């Protein structure tokens, strides 16, 4: 059934699983028309499909041409997501296909279930975790590849960089979600923390800076402070 705090270690066992987040698939700017009406202009989007054990991120870029001439785009967006996830699974060798796909919003369950009827042995699951994957577009290199795309495209990343050389996938996911939670709660401050010291750089083949173990501990602490803070500034406490 649903995924929550009680079965949290299931994410890091040896059954292949993918998280799917659709919150950045259909993205718009809202603006005024010459006549003083309001209109939307779409911008490029992405499906965020993540193996939480390995870090492998299957970033399917959604080019704005896919919406051309279509109606009810927020509903279509869920079915387009399900179509693309299903095509991804079918592209993978059998031994790489997931045994479970966990969607971060319950509105994806029926679209994905219908698209995966050919895979009766793949469990489609919701979660009660409030995961911060919408903040993925605050990662500069991910935002950059989405905005530059001129056609549909799939780009593969490891969202953990090389962290699994030194830490477990449980600890690497906890770090990722802390980073993304911070970026979601205050992007500017989060980004300042990550890049304040110009001597720590992001390798060309990485997403995040090359922090030592001690430096990650300082960083992680700073992100917690920010999250507790903003939570005060928000609720005045």
């Amino acid at each position: 059934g649903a995924m929550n705090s009680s079965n949290y270690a299931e994410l890091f066992n040896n059954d292949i699983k993918l998280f799917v987040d659709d919150t950045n698939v259909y993205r718009v700017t809202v603006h005024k028309t010459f006549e003083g009406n309001v209109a939307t202009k779409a911008i490029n989007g992405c499906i965020f499909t993540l193996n939480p054990k390995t870090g492998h991120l299957f970033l399917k870029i959604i080019h704005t041409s896919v919406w051309a001439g279509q109606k009810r785009l927020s509903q279509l967006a869920k079915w387009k997501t399900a179509e693309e996830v299903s095509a991804l699974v079918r592209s993978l060798p059998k031994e790489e296909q997931p045994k479970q796909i966990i969607v971060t919003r319950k509105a994806m369950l029926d679209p994905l279930e219908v698209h995966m009827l050919d895979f009766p042995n793949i469990a489609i699951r919701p979660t009660e975790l409030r995961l911060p994957f919408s903040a993925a577009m605050s990662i500069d290199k991910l935002s950059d590849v989405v905005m530059k795309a001129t056609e549909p495209q799939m780009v593969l990343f490891n969202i953990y960089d090389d962290w699994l050389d030194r830490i477990s996938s449980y600890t690497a996911f906890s770090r990722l979600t802390l980073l993304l939670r911070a970026l979601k709660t205050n992007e500017e401050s989060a980004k300042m923390i990550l890049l304040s010291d110009p001597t720590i750089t992001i390798k060309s083949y990485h997403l995040w800076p090359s922090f030592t173990d001690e430096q990650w501990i300082t960083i992680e602490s700073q992100m917690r402070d920010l999250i507790l803070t903003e939570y005060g500034r928000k609720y005045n406490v």
Partner: protein, 300 residues
């Protein structure tokens, strides 16, 4: 007019005949039901006074043979039997009609209720849902499960309704996943009507039969089947106009006949609110929406 005689009534029992019912006391001198309209299927049903558990009964058409009820003290129920000797049956019935030991099927002459509930129901199709080919009549009870329920366990005693499942490969064409899930016209018109049922009359017959088994026996899988067949029509954007018009009449009489005090268990809030207010056909069921809103506005 035809007759369903009884050998006796050894146990106290409430007897139903179509939408009528009456109480028979233990060893009361009751010998059956006369004046039953020819031309319609009928259902004779039972609820023991000592055990309201297990409502059960028999679907039959008097044109297909001479049937009688004889209580079985071993199996503990009123059994419907067929008399092959036509002259013994005539002799047996006349005796009971002379001694006035039978209740008369009490049809009001203005009253088309039973016709309206059974318009498309045929014994031959009943016998394909309820498989027991040595008998011309069909036994149903409260606990019988459907073929679809056994897939989610004695197959001989099952209700073989047509399986409807909205998240199934039969319902969803490869490459039309979103289209076919949100507008089920393909599944209704091509898969079910043209492919399985052949025509809308057979579709409506199963729908009516599922409703009646839900109402008379509280058969839960029948109720599921009735709501699924309603929802498949209401969730199709493209339905022939004559089917929609007839559906509205069908449902209207079902809602009209439903016991007011059973609405809580026989009506699915989600299906009905969806059908009347959100579906493609939300504006196509005028009679049904009007009675639903005046009789069960709580549900909505």
């Amino acid at each position: 007019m035809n007759t369903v005689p009884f050998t006796s009534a050894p146990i106290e029992v409430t007897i139903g005949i179509d939408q009528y019912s009456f109480n028979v006391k233990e060893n009361q001198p009751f010998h059956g039901i006369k004046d039953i309209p020819i031309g319609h299927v009928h259902v004779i049903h039972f609820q023991h006074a000592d055990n309201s558990s297990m409502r059960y009964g028999y679907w039959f058409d008097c044109r297909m043979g001479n049937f009688y009820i004889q209580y079985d003290p071993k199996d503990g129920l009123y059994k419907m039997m067929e008399e092959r000797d036509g002259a013994k049956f005539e002799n047996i019935v006349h005796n009971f009609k002379e001694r006035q030991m039978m209740v008369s099927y009490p049809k009001i002459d203005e009253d088309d209720t039973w016709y309206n509930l059974t318009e498309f129901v045929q014994m031959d199709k009943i016998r394909k849902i309820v498989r027991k080919d040595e008998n011309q009549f069909s036994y149903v009870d409260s606990s019988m499960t459907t073929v679809q329920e056994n897939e989610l366990s004695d197959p001989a005693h099952s209700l073989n309704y047509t399986v409807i499942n909205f998240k199934s490969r039969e319902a969803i064409r490869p490459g039309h996943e979103m289209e076919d899930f949100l507008d089920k016209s393909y599944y209704l018109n091509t898969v079910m009507l043209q492919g399985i049922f052949k025509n809308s009359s057979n579709y409506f017959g199963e729908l009516q039969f599922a409703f009646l088994n839900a109402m008379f026996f509280g058969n839960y899988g029948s109720s599921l089947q009735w709501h699924a067949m309603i929802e498949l029509i209401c969730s199709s954007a493209t339905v022939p106009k004559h089917m929609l018009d007839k559906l509205d009449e069908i449902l209207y009489y079902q809602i009209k006949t439903l016991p007011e005090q059973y609405s809580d268990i026989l009506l699915n809030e989600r299906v009905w609110n969806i059908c009347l207010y959100s579906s493609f056909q939300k504006n196509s069921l005028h009679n049904t929406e009007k009675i639903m809103e005046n009789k069960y506005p709580e549900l909505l």
